[PDB]
Write a protein that binds this DNA or RNA. Structure first.
Length: 1339
RNA sequence: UAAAGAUGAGACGCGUUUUAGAGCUAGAAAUAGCAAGUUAAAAUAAGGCUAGUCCGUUAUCAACUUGAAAAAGUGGCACCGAGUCGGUGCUU
DNA sequence: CTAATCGCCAGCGTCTCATCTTTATGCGC
DNA sequence: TGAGACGCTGGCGATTAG
């Protein structure tokens, strides 16, 4: 029947759609309504939008999955410790583990004894008095040699096992080398022995061993090198200090005889690199590295261990005990001093928990920073507190043991303390002597990152492979899991497959077969520039074999370009040459039977990065190489993966045999790929063998983009399917697809807007301009375009020798420099600042030859001073090159038309594949539907030029309006110019020479295909008149027709009125997508105990009345329940009930038992209605409400403000922000000032809409009073506040807003009683099909 | 070459809740005046069967009619108009 | 004696390792 | 070798209103 087109607009939170005919009209249609509402037919229009919530990434779930694994592994460690200790623990105390486990319970629910450790009050308080902290006991067990009971040893060891510090340091640490000055003196003596010169450096010795300053990580290796003049940092000593300071050294160049000695003490490659390093140097430098390692350790552990090293072997214990003692001393001093000086503040400081005193610091939730900030003015006004204020500046004033900065402690200190415990307690306990290695391994064990979860196949994240079927335990880990296979699968399960055969794995990038392919199938026959002969293309089989074997093999370098003359520029062939450099044998690689061996070798070197894994993998390959060869090989690693598989080349027959002029000298790889005789048939069979029945969801999943847009793509597909079903099951003619611009860019640009001031300051400094003192560098002037241009121009005219400065804004012009082809560029790269003088004499270029010749020197100086960008300078100097040529115009056409984003073409391909599914006799695609992609700039310029302004704060109609404008612009563009389909329409089309078939010499005169473009603006045919750079106006015909046909594509008279009638249309289908809420069960905070019934138990038997718990659960969906409830008497009731996320499965198991357990009786099974979030209700007078929760409601109506008021608001708000000709600005200012009375009409409209649907009388009266009291203020700020005023009538959740100074809070609808007697609406994705149910008839 | 984003794995330090760490003196008490604060146990989504040193906050989801599910199917057109859509004519 | 309204509240910091895309863009020339 | 913090919207206790 009729033909139609569909326009779309994909966004993050909205999808707009529209259906237009051939003359840009939106059809209307009568639709059938189901249900029982006695309203059989409704009339709707084919325009609307869909609204939904954004998608979420899996990061927040992953960060909790890792935490759950960490917690259960820690519990397993504690269980292992209990299991080993239980045998000897049974005789000492049979219920000690039970008292430890049940310690959370309250006294009346506990069994055994309340006191966990000893079981009696006097022993418990004696232990607490003897050991205030656990570190007292830990240091006592480290130092004392006396026998102690097993309980204290168990608690100490359990503390070390549960808290063990970080694993960021490889190797072992000796804490006995804590003396920084002794290490520095030892290093100085070592260099005094090693160096030929007697001094260590030019600075001599000054004992400046205080290198523990705050931060200053590489500032030791720089600044102490500045306090050690001499070899500085590039010398041998500077590299050694940087090695001790942790920075990467350069012994290859600074030190002598070292080929490469890049080392790091923390890294596990240390001493493995140093063996090879010291192989090439003498024993003189060997003794220096031990001192360097000692100094590095001394610097490293001095952050934590602030105690003398000659005390004991528990320095962490010593530091914590001295902190505890300092805390006690300063607490006593503070108490005495406060009581002597300020007695009235003692109660507040030491008793009130709600302040930031000591009571709030300990019992309350205050931090040490809050406590310091609160107590600093008191100590400042307080006398005798100089040392206290000094220690406050060093933040060692009442520090606790469990502090946030304890994460810097490595596990070696805890291992040393545990080893001291074991070594001093073996003799008393034989079972403690017998399992020292097991305890140490329990502390030090760690699962490698390439092994993954240790599942048995029921996990969708695991890849670890078992060599045996038994329980994995930390003392038999090395003989159960296959480390090499697991480390291989760790890489392989995340690398992509081959495009040609999507069932085979790709090859390593540095693989020898791949290198042979790159030098064989390419760089041969026609691919070579000269092919080593007079003819650039020849077969030359044996000749090119000899060329590959001699010119490229054993000679591949930069010299291949010169060497190829006698017998490509990108062929490298480097892996084989590195293999020659390592092996120094030329038989394995020359023999072709060993190719699998070399491929396996490069595969292992690419797969594995750990040094231990490579040696274990190559241990089985040790029958043909020696120890030096293995040492050279294990230090070499590659990276990167190719794009082609293995059986693509060797399995398919081979292609490696047939390439390079053996079969054909015509780039045989691509021809053989496209040859369907023997190769492309198998590829087509493999590609068709994919089980892509659900290809929509699979292709969506494999997209490269955010889930927030991957949701919108799927919703767009479903919307198009529903529209095609609606419109008589007829396919559309054209589909226009537009991707909305990002919203995060506005805030990021606002944050980065101050960079213009920094750039202006840097340019003024580079140019040495003294005019910077007359202006400030504040961001206020940066937002002004005229001020920014005056700053960038350094007070001089950009097209004249006169001075402009900041004298007057009216004596300046902002004319662009490239309007000849009308690229429509408004950025500062195309802007320029000059006086009112035009300084031009032609339209083909804004700058003239005389102007260019005059200002070339100043332009060159500004370009050298980084004041003018390269593109701007080239455009300014393009006048001498002969103006805008055909290539420049073609580039302008391409830039205006062709989009570059990669996701738009994927969406277009998805919709094209879903639409066009017909093949011809020659298997050609029948492209009956054209999919068109457009840029946002065209539609935005259309709205700006033809006064179709938008305001996003009024209603949600602008999504549908954007979709409709997309449709009309795309259809008009495809109707007028059918010769440019290859640029902006998806499909297979022959390209055209834009420089020839889309260009004209002058005035676009002549025959067909030359009247396309003389001015490169695309949207020029819409305007009734156009103006050049000068003051000349060229008119246009009223009816725009095709050049090669009589078809009418645009009427200036009638078509604008139709678009205006569409944009003032009141009924637009806005649908909010209902979604069942999922996520967390409740809020994560654990609340203290109380008697309220809103608390949620944290376990099965933990009563919230006695233990606290969570509250605020999240409701998945609500259900309408009609039943009868006892009141001693049964009374019928109809009410809603909120099914939370935690009980959703229990409700769906058996709803009858669920409502019986909740107290409802005699419920009706068939009357249960599932009501998800954002369900819609009708009520009275069109007052719609959206169900936000089981006891909340949301606004659900839309305000249809007229387009005259929308235009007036947009003009009034941008009163000083509009960009255009100064003649046009005065007209708009007069238009705003001539219609001041519209504001009262807008307020009346808001009041009339609010009194019917909103019902917010108090807020409405406050709004009216605030509007009345601010009438004298000017129209600009008044309209800017009236835009804020629309938050009252917006759709969705209520929110607060401001009107000048007064703040209006939110009015919330906290009762769902009124919706029980309304009409529920179930609507489809487009909202065209509805099913209305009258709930008042239920019961 | 750098930056960003999306995935997956292994670890650390805190925090928050109950319990243990005997408070003293004066009254008939209500309450007042003193002393002490630094630590430890357990839990960290309730739980599940496939019983693993696994899994549990991502994606997907109007109504009705079939089907265990996957999945499939269900709604006339034209013309005047417009306050969230109405009216008229033809037809089934 | 129950229902409507006002004010408050929301678990958080760090390190190591691996894979893939996409968008600017520098060096050489 | 670094930007700086809000912002959101439903639940809950305490208070007022009819």
């Amino acid at each position: 029947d009729k033909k139609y087109s569909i326009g779309l607009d994909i966004g993050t939170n909205s999808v707009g759609w529209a259906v237009i005919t051939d003359e840009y009209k939106v059809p209307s249609k009568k639709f059938k309504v189901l249900g029982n509402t006695d309203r059989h037919s409704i009339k709707k229009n084919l325009i609307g939008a869909l609204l939904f919530d954004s998608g979420e990434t899996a990061e927040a779930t992953r960060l909790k999955r890792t935490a759950r694994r960490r917690y259960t592994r820690r519990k397993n460690r504690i269980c292992y410790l209990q299991e080993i200790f239980s045998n000897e623990m049974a005789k000492v105390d049979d219920s000690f583990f039970h008292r430890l486990e049940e310690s959370f319970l309250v006294e009346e629910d506990k069994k055994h004894e309340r006191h966990p450790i000893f079981g009696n009050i006097v022993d418990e308080v004696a232990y607490h008095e003897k050991y205030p902290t656990i570190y007292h006991l830990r240091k006592k067990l480290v130092d004392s040699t006396d026998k102690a009971d097993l309980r204290l040893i168990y608690l100490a060891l359990a503390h070390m096992i549960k808290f063990r510090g970080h694993f960021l340091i490889e190797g072992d640490l000796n804490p006995d080398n804590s003396d920084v000055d002794k290490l520095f003196i030892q290093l100085v003596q070592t260099y005094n022995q090693l160096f030929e010169e007697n001094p260590i450096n030019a600075s001599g010795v000054d004992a400046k061993a205080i290198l523990s300053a705050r931060l200053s990580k590489s500032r030791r290796l720089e600044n102490l090198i500045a306090q050690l003049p001499g070899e500085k940092k590039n010398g041998l000593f500077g590299n050694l200090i940087a090695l001790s300071l942790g920075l990467t050294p350069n012994f290859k160049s600074n030190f002598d005889l070292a080929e490469d000695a890049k080392l790091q003490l923390s890294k596990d490659t240390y001493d493995d690199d140093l063996d090879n390093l010291l192989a090439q140097i003498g024993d003189q430098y060997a003794d220096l590295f031990l001192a360097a390692k000692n100094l590095s350790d001394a610097i490293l552990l001095s952050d934590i261990l602030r105690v003398n090293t000659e005390i004991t072997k528990a320095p962490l214990s010593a530091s914590m005990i001295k902190r505890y003692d300092e805390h006690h001393q300063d607490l006593t001093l503070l108490k005495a001093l406060v009581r002597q000086q300020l007695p009235e503040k003692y109660k507040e400081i030491f008793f009130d928990q709600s302040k930031n005193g000591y009571a709030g610091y300990i019992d309350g939730g205050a931090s040490q920073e809050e406590f310091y900030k609160f107590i600093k003015p008191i100590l400042e006004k307080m006398d005798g507190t100089e040392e206290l204020l000094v220690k406050l500046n060093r933040e060692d004033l009442l520090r606790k043991q469990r502090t946030f900065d304890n994460g810097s402690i490595p596990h070696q200190i805890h291992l040393g303390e545990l080893h001291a415990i074991l070594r001093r307690q073996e003799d008393f306990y034989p079972f403690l002597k017998d399992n020292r290695e097991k305890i140490e391994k329990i502390l030090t064990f760690r699962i490698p990152y390439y092994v993954g979860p240790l599942a048995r196949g029921n996990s969708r994240f695991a890849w670890m492979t078992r060599k045996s079927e038994e329980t994995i335990t930390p003392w038999n880990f090395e003989e159960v899991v296959d480390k090499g296979a697991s480390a291989q699968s760790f890489i392989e399960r995340m690398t992509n497959f081959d495009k040609n055969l999507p069932n085979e794995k790709v090859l390593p990038k540095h693989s020898l077969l791949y290198e042979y392919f790159t030098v064989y199938n390419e760089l041969t026959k026609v691919k070579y520039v000269t092919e080593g002969m007079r003819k650039p293309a020849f077969l030359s089989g044996e000749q090119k074999k000899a060329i590959v074997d001699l010119l490229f093999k054993t000679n591949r370098k930069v010299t291949v370009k010169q060497l190829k003359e006698d017998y490509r520029f990108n062929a490298s062939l480097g892996t084989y040459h590195d293999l020659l450099k390592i092996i120094k044998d030329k038989d394995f690689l020359d023999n072709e039977e060993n190719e699998d061996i070399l491929e396996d070798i490069v595969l292992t070197l690419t797969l594995f990065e750990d040094r231990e894994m490579i040696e274990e993998r190559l241990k089985t390959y040790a029958h043909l190489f020696d120890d030096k060869v293995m040492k050279q090989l294990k230090r070499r690693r590659y990276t990167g993966w190719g794009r082609l598989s293995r059986k693509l080349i060797n399995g398919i027959r081979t292609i490696l045999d047939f390439l390079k002029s053996d079969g054909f000298a015509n780039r045989n790889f691509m021809q053989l790929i496209h040859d369907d005789s023997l190769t492309f048939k198998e590829d087509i069979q493999k590609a068709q063998v994919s089980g892509q029945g659900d290809s929509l969801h699979e292709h969506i999943a494999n997209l490269a983009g955010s889930p927030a847009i991957k949701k919108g793509i799927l919703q767009t597909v479903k919307v198009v399917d529903e529209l095609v079903k609606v419109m008589g099951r007829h396919k559309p003619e054209n589909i226009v697809i537009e991707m909305a611009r990002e919203n995060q860019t506005t805030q990021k640009g606002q944050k980065n807007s101050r960079e213009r001031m920094k750039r202006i300051e840097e340019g003024i400094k580079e140019l040495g301009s003294q005019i910077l003192k007359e202006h400030p560098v504040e961001n206020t002037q940066l937002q002004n375009e005229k001020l920014y241009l005056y700053y960038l121009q350094n007070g001089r005219d950009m097209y004249v020798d006169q001075e402009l400065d900041i004298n007057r804004l009216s004596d300046y012009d902002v004319d662009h420099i490239v309007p000849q082809s009308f690229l429509k560029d408004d950025s500062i790269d195309n802007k320029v600042l000059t006086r009112s003088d035009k300084n031009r004499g032609k339209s083909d270029n804004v700058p003239s030859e005389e102007v260019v010749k005059k200002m070339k020197n100043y332009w060159r100086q500004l370009l050298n001073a980084k004041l003018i960008t390269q593109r701007k300078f080239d455009n300014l100097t393009k006048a001498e090159r002969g103006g805008l040529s055909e290539l420049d115009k073609a580039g302008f056409i391409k830039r205006q038309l062709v989009e570059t984003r990669q996701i738009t073409k994927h969406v277009a391909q998805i919709l094209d594949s879903r639409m066009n599914t017909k093949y011809d006799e020659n298997d050609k695609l029948i492209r009956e539907v054209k999919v068109i992609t457009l840029k946002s700039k065209l539609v935005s310029d259309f709205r700006k030029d033809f006064q179709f302004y938008k305001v996003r704060e009024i209603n949600n109609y602008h999504h549908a309006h954007d979709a409709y404008l997309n449709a009309v612009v795309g259809t008009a563009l495809i109707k007028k110019y059918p010769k440019l389909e290859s640029e902006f329409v998806y499909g297979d089309y022959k390209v055209y020479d834009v420089r020839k078939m889309i260009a004209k010499s002058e005035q676009e005169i002549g025959k067909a295909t030359a009247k396309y473009f003389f001015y490169s603006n695309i949207m020029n045919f819409f305007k009734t008149e156009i103006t050049l750079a000068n003051g000349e106006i060229r008119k246009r015909p009223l009816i725009e027709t095709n050049g090669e046909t009589g078809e009418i594509v645009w009427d200036k008279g009638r078509d604008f009125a139709t678009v205006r009638k569409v944009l003032s249309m009141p009924q637009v289908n806005i649908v909010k997508k209902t979604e069942v809420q999922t996520g967390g069960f409740s809020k994560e905070s654990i609340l203290p105990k109380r008697n309220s019934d809103k608390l949620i138990a944290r376990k099965k038997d933990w009563d919230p009345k006695k233990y606290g718990g969570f509250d605020s659960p999240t409701v998945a969906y609500s259900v309408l329940v009609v039943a009868k409830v006892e009141k001693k008497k049964l009374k019928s009731v109809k009410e809603l009930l909120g099914i939370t996320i935690m009980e959703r499965s229990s409700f769906e198991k058996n709803p009858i038992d669920f409502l019986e357990a909740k107290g409802y009786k005699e419920v009706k099974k068939d009357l249960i209605i599932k009501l998800p979030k954002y369900s819609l209700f009708e009520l009275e007078n069109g007052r719609k409400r959206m169900l936000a929760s089981a006891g909340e409601l949301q606004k659900g109506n839309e305000l249809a403000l007229p387009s005259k008021y929308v235009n007036f608001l947009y003009l009034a708000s941008h009163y000083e922000k509009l960009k255009g000709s100064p003649e046009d600005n005065e007209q708009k200012q007069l238009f705003v000032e001539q219609h001041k009375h519209y504001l009262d009409e807008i307020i009346e409209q808001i009041s009339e809409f609010s009194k019917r649907v909103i019902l917010a009388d108090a807020n409405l009266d406050k709004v009216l009073s605030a509007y009345n009291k601010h009438r004298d203020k000017p129209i600009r700020e008044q309209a800017e506040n009236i835009i804020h005023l629309f938050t009252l009538t917006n759709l969705g959740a209520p929110a607060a807003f401001k009107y000048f100074d007064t703040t209006i809070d939110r009015k919330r609808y906290t009762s769902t009683k009124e919706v029980l007697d309304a009409t529920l609406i179930h609507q489809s994705i487009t909202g065209l099909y509805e099913t209305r149910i009258d709930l008042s008839q239920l019961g």
